[PDB]
């Protein structure tokens, strides 16, 4: 992971927030660091660039210039300060590594920012095993249900990534200021339960990751 | 003299290319914004080829540009001196 | 500020075929366009740099064409792992800009949904609620009609469906359906059924479980 | 000599910039009509960079332009003389 | 003679909101546009110079954008004291010209 | 007041008129003076420029070139001569101070020119106090009526500018070659009449300014 930036943030409306981007790998004098914003269901919005070594930054003319860029030369981490936000400002925020030649070779993971007054709630994970009388085809479908978390997002994994074949994590639904999604996974009814299967649900916003084995109905 | 004015020109052409990108970025329109063509721009300049490829639009870019001309044309008013003397002697004998 | 304009917005195509997303600038930028792929949930990913040159680690399917104000990303063949949004980004004049983006959809053979009905977990009821989740997995087209019933009588409330973007292993779609009740209410109903009328089946595909 | 041909060039570059705006204003089309870029234009000229940024379109603007070339190229055929001698001596020792 | 073309002519908006008057030239003029405000009965009043740079004494609401042939005056918020006609004026090629103007209604 | 130009002029059709612009402040060698015309209900029409120090002037190609520019180097005043006018030429005429960098930093007050054969009539100002039986709300509205003046305009002021809160001067109406407008002002019925209130009506065209206190109906 080259460009490395936090998972999720929550900001009260009108409050300020700082955003980080630590960049292992090379740290060239001539490197530039950009920041691109992705509102949900939209395209990429170039916000601004910073050359960390020399220190100058340049921001997007067109947009309401809410932000200001900084860096820490001898920590290889760069920062973007978004000051006094609305819910127009809720979006994914990437940092990119332009070498100075004009394209974003390296991309961060993105930081989800949700501007709301609501409270941060960890998730609740419940396993989803087939009924006590469903006829088992060659494959078997089973999942787990992440209910009532805030804000978005949650990383959903199966056996902590080893079983990445047959998965569909579903989009969260909103309700009364909490979220809800599910995930699916499918294995041969030969291997399961003779091979154990667990879904892990990280929630970066609350800093809580949780496990759950999908055992049969004992 | 020998390869002395030569080296100084290459300081100018790199430091020029570098600072040109720093000056022009942020000005809506400048084409002089990647270190590659920023370097090629500083050659057109030192040599007075005026091909019309790239040029600065900020004030500070024009300043960098002037320094390149002065420090380049001077170097190149001497680097070609070297080549001229060197090769006219060699080819004549 | 340079305007990149990707037409069309969406691009249907059958698997294995060639495909070409046009990008058209608002003034000449030479060759300083670059292409990016961004699948569902993931960050963008440089595909072609400087309008033609390839990137080390990108499948040879992708072929950069064009110069001036007409540019073209091309994929010599198509497979399901290629479904994503595709963005262009000029570096010729400040500021760097992006295009509006193009999503790639795949016409494939029609496929019938895998239905799976799930009773609320033993852990879940030990709070104060019971949700019946029912997965429709890997169908095509994405147009599917879920239906809930309790004991044979059709329940239209407390129903949260969710649809996946077109999956990129198979070119198919999937859909979940949370059924939000209360533990109190779940206990005074015996049956719960999940019917899915889809294009592949005049007969509606059904699944159900009974607590008792 | 020392900083003498230097100073004269700067007379040329200012008086040039000034008169260029005076000559070109009134001609429908000229871009050489504000004292800032009028000054930058007279540098491109003295130094023969021919970047193609600005240029005159009136007759009298072209005349001013010629004077800049002559009085500039001459100065600059001497200002770089100074720099060359000065710095080759310094860097060589 | 360069043609500045401000569309729209009139600009309805609710108070406190962002607002943007486009100005569109008839050929590239780089950044040599300048914006002027002229309220009822009063003389014009320089708002933004050189398409982006601000003027000392102008509220920070006004934000100059654009370059080439697409330019944009923006007011990050709106209040009642901002109702006026707004004019653009290029200095790239002789003669200096003006736009048709845009009035702001609330 | 940087650029300072007269209030109003009247010109017989076909006659000529000179227009002044005295400019306190700096007087740089490189300064340019422009003149912009604003026909009523129209936009700004650049007419011509003059550099006073050096002495040359340039006029607008497109328009009928009716005018000619001059200056007085050692009086810091510049002039524009409009020769043989019609009523197409009736408009506001500003002078501007371009530094030589391409924008009009400083603007004059504008000179209203009305080309007509009619005669110049001073105004008639009548106070406007509430009726002897109107119920007085917290605020109280009162004005004064400028009737039968020619040509436009008239500067209308309240307490000579001190009370600039609650005013609407109305557009003049035309009739039989004379004008008519009103003005409004609103104060707390606590403060008035216990605090006196007077409207002053300057008429630059005729060179007559007049006062009128809005007393109650005694
Ligand atoms: Ba040359
Ligand atoms: K040239």
Short mmCIF file of C-alpha atoms in Angstrom, two decimals, chain D residues 37-90:
data_model
loop_
_atom_site.label_atom_id
_atom_site.label_comp_id
_atom_site.label_asym_id
_atom_site.label_seq_id
_atom_site.Cartn_x
_atom_site.Cartn_y
_atom_site.Cartn_z
CA UNK D 37 3.31 42.69 -21.11
CA UNK D 38 4.67 45.57 -23.20
CA UNK D 39 7.77 45.26 -21.03
CA UNK D 40 7.94 41.47 -21.27
CA UNK D 41 7.56 41.83 -25.03
CA UNK D 42 10.68 44.03 -25.21
CA UNK D 43 12.70 41.34 -23.44
CA UNK D 44 11.62 38.60 -25.78
CA UNK D 45 12.80 41.03 -28.44
CA UNK D 46 16.19 42.20 -27.12
CA UNK D 47 17.03 38.66 -26.30
CA UNK D 48 15.98 37.13 -29.70
CA UNK D 49 13.77 34.48 -28.01
CA UNK D 50 10.97 34.92 -30.53
CA UNK D 51 8.55 32.99 -28.30
CA UNK D 52 5.64 34.32 -30.35
CA UNK D 53 3.91 35.73 -27.28
CA UNK D 54 3.19 39.34 -28.47
CA UNK D 55 4.27 41.51 -31.40
CA UNK D 56 3.32 44.85 -32.98
CA UNK D 57 0.85 45.42 -35.80
CA UNK D 58 1.03 49.20 -36.38
CA UNK D 59 3.85 50.63 -38.45
CA UNK D 60 5.14 52.71 -35.54
CA UNK D 61 5.04 49.70 -33.24
CA UNK D 62 7.27 47.82 -35.66
CA UNK D 63 9.64 50.80 -35.66
CA UNK D 64 9.83 50.81 -31.85
CA UNK D 65 10.33 47.05 -32.15
CA UNK D 66 13.30 47.45 -34.50
CA UNK D 67 14.94 49.97 -32.16
CA UNK D 68 14.63 47.42 -29.35
CA UNK D 69 16.29 44.68 -31.41
CA UNK D 70 19.15 46.95 -32.50
CA UNK D 71 19.68 48.63 -29.13
CA UNK D 72 18.90 45.39 -27.29
CA UNK D 73 20.88 42.89 -29.37
CA UNK D 74 23.81 45.30 -29.17
CA UNK D 75 23.53 45.65 -25.40
CA UNK D 76 22.94 41.93 -25.14
CA UNK D 77 25.81 41.30 -27.54
CA UNK D 78 27.78 43.01 -24.71
CA UNK D 79 25.93 42.23 -21.46
CA UNK D 80 26.55 38.56 -22.12
CA UNK D 81 30.13 39.54 -22.93
CA UNK D 82 30.46 40.90 -19.37
CA UNK D 83 28.86 37.88 -17.64
CA UNK D 84 30.96 35.46 -19.78
CA UNK D 85 34.33 37.09 -18.96
CA UNK D 86 33.43 37.79 -15.28
CA UNK D 87 32.17 34.32 -14.44
CA UNK D 88 34.57 32.28 -16.54
CA UNK D 89 37.41 34.03 -14.66
CA UNK D 90 35.77 33.53 -11.26
#
